[PDB]
Amino acid sequence: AKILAVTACPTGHTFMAADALKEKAKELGVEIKVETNGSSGIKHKLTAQEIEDAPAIIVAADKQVEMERFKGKRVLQVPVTAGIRRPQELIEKAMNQDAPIY
């Protein structure tokens, strides 16, 4: 199991949020995989198996993300800016499953 994230923004912030999440996860000694949805497209797309196994998924997004793949999973939906400003809070909420089922 590992927590997952998706970051996205209209102009494709996306990458700054992914960076902040990854750097903070390393600081906290926890694994994370971050899918990005930017201007060039999708990178590090989450797999169905990763999603099944995830305690929760962080979706830090300022544009629409494909969400139906997350049905039944706990999803912490926040603005993309939250990934930059408060990655520790998001990671620790995801770990604690402090997120509603989608």
Curated annotation (Swiss-Prot):
Reported function: The phosphoenolpyruvate-dependent sugar phosphotransferase system (sugar PTS), a major carbohydrate active transport system, catalyzes the phosphorylation of incoming sugar substrates concomitantly with their translocation across the cell membrane. This system is involved in fructose transport.
Localization: Cell membrane
Residues the record lists as Phosphocysteine modifications: 9
Protein name (record): PTS system fructose-specific EIIABC component
Residues of the full protein shown: 171 to 273 of 635
Catalytic residues, chain numbering: 9
Domain PTS EIIB type-2: 3-96
Domain notes: The PTS EIIA type-2 domain is phosphorylated by phospho-HPr on a histidyl residue. Then, it transfers the phosphoryl group to the PTS EIIB type-2 domain.
